[PDB]
Design an enzyme around this catalytic site. Structure first.
Site, PDB file in Angstrom:
ATOM      1  CG  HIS A  24      -2.019  -1.029   1.093  1.00 37.94           C
ATOM      2  ND1 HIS A  24      -2.863  -1.129   0.009  1.00 37.94           N
ATOM      3  CD2 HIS A  24      -2.336  -2.058   1.912  1.00 37.94           C
ATOM      4  CE1 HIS A  24      -3.664  -2.167   0.174  1.00 37.94           C
ATOM      5  NE2 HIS A  24      -3.363  -2.748   1.320  1.00 37.94           N
ATOM      6  CE1 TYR A  52      13.493 -10.710  -8.481  1.00 31.67           C
ATOM      7  CE2 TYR A  52      13.009  -8.387  -8.463  1.00 31.67           C
ATOM      8  CZ  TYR A  52      12.645  -9.672  -8.222  1.00 31.67           C
ATOM      9  OH  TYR A  52      11.399  -9.929  -7.679  1.00 31.67           O
ATOM     10  CB  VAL A 130      10.449 -11.090   0.664  1.00 32.29           C
ATOM     11  CG1 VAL A 130       9.959  -9.666   0.457  1.00 32.29           C
ATOM     12  CG2 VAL A 130      10.183 -11.475   2.086  1.00 32.29           C
ATOM     13  NE  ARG A 131      11.069  -8.341  -5.444  1.00 35.41           N
ATOM     14  CZ  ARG A 131      10.305  -7.352  -5.894  1.00 35.41           C
ATOM     15  NH1 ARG A 131      10.150  -6.247  -5.196  1.00 35.41           N
ATOM     16  NH2 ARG A 131       9.689  -7.486  -7.082  1.00 35.41           N
ATOM     17  N   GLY A 134       6.244 -12.946  -4.082  1.00 35.83           N
ATOM     18  CA  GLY A 134       5.555 -11.704  -4.381  1.00 35.83           C
ATOM     19  C   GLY A 134       5.325 -11.585  -5.887  1.00 35.83           C
ATOM     20  CG  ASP A 135       8.691 -11.207  -8.430  1.00 35.50           C
ATOM     21  OD1 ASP A 135       9.874 -11.662  -8.499  1.00 35.50           O
ATOM     22  OD2 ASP A 135       8.466 -10.023  -8.090  1.00 35.50           O
ATOM     23  N   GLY A 139       2.653  -9.621  -8.209  1.00 31.73           N
ATOM     24  CA  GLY A 139       3.239  -9.312  -9.506  1.00 31.73           C
ATOM     25  C   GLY A 139       2.304  -9.521 -10.675  1.00 31.73           C
TER      26      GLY A 139
HETATM   27  C1  HEM Z   1       7.494  -5.298  -3.322  1.00 30.54           C
HETATM   28  C2  HEM Z   1       6.102  -5.486  -2.991  1.00 30.54           C
HETATM   29  C3  HEM Z   1       5.579  -6.819  -2.645  1.00 30.54           C
HETATM   30  C4  HEM Z   1       6.107  -7.862  -2.133  1.00 30.54           C
HETATM   31  C5  HEM Z   1       7.535  -8.065  -1.749  1.00 30.54           C
HETATM   32  C6  HEM Z   1       5.175  -8.920  -1.970  1.00 30.54           C
HETATM   33  C7  HEM Z   1       5.266 -10.151  -1.510  1.00 30.54           C
HETATM   34  C8  HEM Z   1       4.405 -11.225  -1.327  1.00 30.54           C
HETATM   35  C9  HEM Z   1       4.584 -12.556  -0.832  1.00 30.54           C
HETATM   36  C10 HEM Z   1       5.933 -12.963  -0.277  1.00 30.54           C
HETATM   37  C11 HEM Z   1       3.390 -13.276  -0.896  1.00 30.54           C
HETATM   38  C12 HEM Z   1       3.201 -14.680  -0.452  1.00 30.54           C
HETATM   39  C13 HEM Z   1       2.508 -14.819   0.855  1.00 30.54           C
HETATM   40  C14 HEM Z   1       2.505 -16.251   1.297  1.00 30.54           C
HETATM   41  O1  HEM Z   1       1.654 -17.058   0.785  1.00 30.54           O
HETATM   42  O2  HEM Z   1       3.317 -16.666   2.186  1.00 30.54           O
HETATM   43  C15 HEM Z   1       2.509 -12.324  -1.452  1.00 30.54           C
HETATM   44  C16 HEM Z   1       1.123 -12.650  -1.726  1.00 30.54           C
HETATM   45  C17 HEM Z   1       0.189 -11.779  -2.239  1.00 30.54           C
HETATM   46  N1  HEM Z   1       0.341 -10.461  -2.594  1.00 30.54           N
HETATM   47 FE1  HEM Z   1       2.052  -9.383  -2.269  1.00 30.54          FE
HETATM   48  N2  HEM Z   1       3.943  -8.442  -2.443  1.00 30.54           N
HETATM   49  C18 HEM Z   1       4.120  -7.188  -2.829  1.00 30.54           C
HETATM   50  C19 HEM Z   1       3.150  -6.373  -3.419  1.00 30.54           C
HETATM   51  C20 HEM Z   1       1.824  -6.665  -3.637  1.00 30.54           C
HETATM   52  C21 HEM Z   1       0.936  -5.815  -4.347  1.00 30.54           C
HETATM   53  C22 HEM Z   1       1.194  -4.406  -4.833  1.00 30.54           C
HETATM   54  C23 HEM Z   1      -0.272  -6.424  -4.266  1.00 30.54           C
HETATM   55  C24 HEM Z   1      -1.608  -5.886  -4.828  1.00 30.54           C
HETATM   56  C25 HEM Z   1      -1.686  -6.142  -6.146  1.00 30.54           C
HETATM   57  C26 HEM Z   1      -0.166  -7.716  -3.676  1.00 30.54           C
HETATM   58  C27 HEM Z   1      -1.072  -8.704  -3.469  1.00 30.54           C
HETATM   59  C28 HEM Z   1      -0.897  -9.960  -3.030  1.00 30.54           C
HETATM   60  C29 HEM Z   1      -1.783 -11.044  -2.893  1.00 30.54           C
HETATM   61  C30 HEM Z   1      -3.271 -10.869  -3.270  1.00 30.54           C
HETATM   62  C31 HEM Z   1      -1.206 -12.197  -2.393  1.00 30.54           C
HETATM   63  C32 HEM Z   1      -1.827 -13.477  -2.119  1.00 30.54           C
HETATM   64  C33 HEM Z   1      -1.551 -14.544  -3.170  1.00 30.54           C
HETATM   65  C34 HEM Z   1      -2.116 -14.275  -4.481  1.00 30.54           C
HETATM   66  O3  HEM Z   1      -3.315 -13.851  -4.539  1.00 30.54           O
HETATM   67  O4  HEM Z   1      -1.560 -14.442  -5.601  1.00 30.54           O
HETATM   68  N3  HEM Z   1       1.226  -7.810  -3.264  1.00 30.54           N
HETATM   69  N4  HEM Z   1       3.057 -11.113  -1.755  1.00 30.54           N
END
Ligand code: HEM
Ligand SMILES: OC[C@H]1O[C@@](CO)(O[C@H]2O[C@H](CO)[C@@H](O)[C@H](O)[C@H]2O)[C@@H](O)[C@@H]1O
Length: 212
Positions: A24, A52, A130-131, A134-135, A139
């Site tokens: 956010h 990266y 984390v990266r 997230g991607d 991503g």
């Molecule tokens: C540099 C920024 C970000 C990082 C490092 C990051 C990292 C991560 C990680 C590590 C997970 C996996 C959680 C787990 O299952 O243990 C995750 C899941 C998720 N992230 Fe983030 N994230 C970032 C930005 C965002 C953004 C901007 C959004 C909104 C679009 C978002 C939405 C989600 C959602 C919805 C999940 C749940 C799994 C999925 O629906 O595909 N994230 N993220």
């Protein structure tokens, strides 16, 4: 946060607040809602190439050491595809000699290089999770929004496409299973969890500095 449900769950819960803060950040929020543009997305991707590159060097070191080998899948490497995306977005290779690391990226890269030098397996796994997860998650939304709001060509979003990986949800589930199977001492686990929060903190500051 609990540890009785495995590392994957402990990681998710321990970093939930830090994830929310990064997700956010004003810069990312404005980018995804259509308030910025392809120029700002390109600036983000240039900074991402710098970190990266550092990350993947650290991954190579730790994978070579034998730690978490199956988790550290080379198919995840992004630096080369990202450079190709940047070639498209910028129209040439000019960016290589122009870009400079923001203060946030200096710190992030320095830490990744320290992990590489120390061959710190637990800390590397934290940064990898984390990266890359997230991607493979947020991503995917970023890619769709660059196409939708800004008309970015999909061929310049290869970073998000993970060529070589078939089923995405299956891949993440297997990734978490590998996390749960990592043999870590209590000290290593504590170190990994703290580092994962730091990884999110670095990422938030990258967005903050882009917003300035
Ligand atoms: C540099 C920024 C970000 C990082 C490092 C990051 C990292 C991560 C990680 C590590 C997970 C996996 C959680 C787990 O299952 O243990 C995750 C899941 C998720 N992230 Fe983030 N994230 C970032 C930005 C965002 C953004 C901007 C959004 C909104 C679009 C978002 C939405 C989600 C959602 C919805 C999940 C749940 C799994 C999925 O629906 O595909 N994230 N993220
Ligand atoms: O799901 C990603 C990530 O978001 C967090 C907060 O960082 O949870 C929020 O988002 C979820 C939906 O994506 C909601 O279900 C949840 O209630 C909300 O706090 C993390 O807990 C989660 O890993």
């Amino acid at each position: 946060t609990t540890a009785t449900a495995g590392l994957a769950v402990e990681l998710k819960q321990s970093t939930a607040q830090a994830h929310e803060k990064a997700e956010h950040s004003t810069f990312m929020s404005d980018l995804l809602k259509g308030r910025l543009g392809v120029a700002e997305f390109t600036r983000l991707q240039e900074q991402a190439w710098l970190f990266y590159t550092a990350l993947e060097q650290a991954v190579d070191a730790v994978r070579a050491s034998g730690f978490a080998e199956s988790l550290l899948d080379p198919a995840l490497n992004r630096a080369e595809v990202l450079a190709r995306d940047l070639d498209k977005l910028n129209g040439s290779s000019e960016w290589r000699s122009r870009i400079t690391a923001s203060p946030a990226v200096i710190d992030y890269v320095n830490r990744l290089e320290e992990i590489r030098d120390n061959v710190d397996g637990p800390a590397l796994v934290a940064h990898h999770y984390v990266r890359y997860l997230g991607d493979l998650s947020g991503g995917q939304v970023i890619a769709r929004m660059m196409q939708r709001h800004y008309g970015v060509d999909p061929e310049a979003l290869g970073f998000y496409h993970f060529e070589g990986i078939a089923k995405l949800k299956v891949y993440k589930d297997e990734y978490r299973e590998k996390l749960n199977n990592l043999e870590l001492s209590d000290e290593q686990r504590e170190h990994l969890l703290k580092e994962a929060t730091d990884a999110f903190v670095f990422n938030h500051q990258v967005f903050a500095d882009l917003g300035k």
